[PDB]
């Protein structure tokens, strides 16, 4: 899993060399940031649910036809799934904030994203809206660096999805 | 083929693709250090083998170094590789 700390270790390990000042400087960077990151995670974790409801909802407004019978958005099972999925995205994001790297995101969400989505005919677009809607809400509960961090990670996914 | 591989999957998968290539395995499967198979006829070779290998391989004193000026030199096999056949 890719976090700042793991990477410098890895790099040191490959070369076969002790951790020297170079790497520690980097580490120092992380952990300094953490304070903001951690704050952001506390905020998302708390409002989770509400964010999720709002998102799922949004998607339907954005793509009305999904809720029509014979579509994907239709019938509770699917709605349940839709909820579940977004929860996941969120969950991971928090993780990544705390871990201080994209690592968690990469391994759970991103790797294999395309093919899964292809085989089950999940349209990236949807997810994206979810995220965007989220981003917008988060853009109230947070501020300054905490906010900035939250965004970064949220986006990271947008880009991976698109 | 290799440039695409690198863009999808990065330097590690790029490298792995040469060592794990069938061609590498058939000539020097395991237990044999790779040697210059160029400069002598290899099945499948395609002409251009011999000519291009002479550009990539200077003398035995030459090396593939960057130390002269930081950058490696430019490809030097791009113009070859894309030459028309001379009017027979």
């Amino acid at each position: 899993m890719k976090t700042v700390i793991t990477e410098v270790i890895a790099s040191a390990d490959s070369q076969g060399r002790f951790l020297n000042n170079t790497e520690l400087q980097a580490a120092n960077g992380r952990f300094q940031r953490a304070t903001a990151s951690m704050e952001a995670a506390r905020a998302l974790t708390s409002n989770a649910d509400s964010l999720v409801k709002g998102a799922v909802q949004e998607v339907y407004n954005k793509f009305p036809y999904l809720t029509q019978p014979g579509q994907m958005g239709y019938g509770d099972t699917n709605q349940a799934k839709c909820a579940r999925d977004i929860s996941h995205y969120l969950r991971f994001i928090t993780y990544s904030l705390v871990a201080g790297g994209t690592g968690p995101l990469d391994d759970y969400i991103v790797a294999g994203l395309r093919e899964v989505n292809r085989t089950f005919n999940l349209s990236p677009s949807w997810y994206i809206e979810a995220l965007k809607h989220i981003k917008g809400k988060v853009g109230s509960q947070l501020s300054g660096q905490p906010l900035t961090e939250a965004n970064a990670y949220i986006d990271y996914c947008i880009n991976a999805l698109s | 083929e290799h440039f695409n591989r690198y863009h999808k999957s990065g330097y590690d998968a790029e490298i792995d693709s040469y060592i794990d290539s069938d061609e590498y395995r058939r000539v020097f499967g395991e237990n044999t250090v790779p040697y210059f198979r160029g400069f002598k006829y290899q099945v499948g070779q395609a002409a251009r083998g011999f000519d291009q290998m002479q550009q990539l391989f200077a003398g035995d004193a030459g090396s593939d170094t960057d130390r002269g000026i930081g950058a490696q030199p430019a490809a030097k096999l791009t113009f070859p590789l894309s030459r028309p056949l001379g009017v027979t």
Binding site: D107, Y108, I109, V110, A111, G112, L113, E115, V116, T119 | -
Partner: protein, 172 residues
């Protein structure tokens, strides 16, 4: 590798003999079915994507936990693998079907598969299940195509089955 023809040869070789007339007549008739045989294969390959897609849906409806955190098909990365694998198995099966011989399937594909699954902690049972799910869907197509001359494919259909089953068994 091997296939129906080559196989018969090899047998004959160890006896040290020319092929028996009886034995030729196996091959002679085998040829006659070719056209049927081909269409069968064509049907699978044509529907491949779907076959899988379908089977998967059913697999996950049954074994909900595979897709739950802590399950074997979670997260995405894993899911992807699971799909990929299914497909491969299918691919091979088809190959066999054309060859008219299990071998190719056994040697390239099935050999070592169980053990892999074991080492990973992949639940062999579920894998097998998937293979069957596939089987049924596939037959579905083989047996109900469009624009084909009407006739009896049973013989081929059964052989198809067997291949699927060898797979199921050796994995399981």
């Amino acid at each position: 590798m091997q296939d129906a023809f080559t196989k018969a040869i090899v047998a004959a070789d160890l006896r040290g003999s020319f092929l028996s007339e009886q034995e030729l007549n196996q091959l002679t008739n085998l040829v006659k079915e070719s056209n049927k045989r081909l269409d069968a294969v064509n049907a699978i390959t044509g529907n491949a994507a779907e076959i899988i897609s379908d089977a998967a849906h059913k697999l996950f409806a049954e074994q909900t936990d595979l897709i739950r955190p802590g399950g074997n098909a979670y997260p995405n990365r894993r899911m992807a693998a699971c799909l990929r694998d299914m497909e491969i198995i299918l691919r091979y099966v088809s190959y066999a079907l054309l060859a008219g011989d299990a071998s190719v399937l056994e040697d390239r594909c099935l050999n070592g598969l169980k053990e892999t699954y074991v080492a990973l902690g992949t639940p062999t049972r579920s894998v097998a299940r998937a293979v069957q799910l596939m089987k049924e869907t596939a037959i579905g197509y083989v047996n109900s195509p469009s624009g084909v001359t009407r006739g009896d494919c049973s013989a081929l259909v059964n052989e198809a089955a067997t291949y699927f089953d060898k797979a199921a068994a050796s994995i399981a």
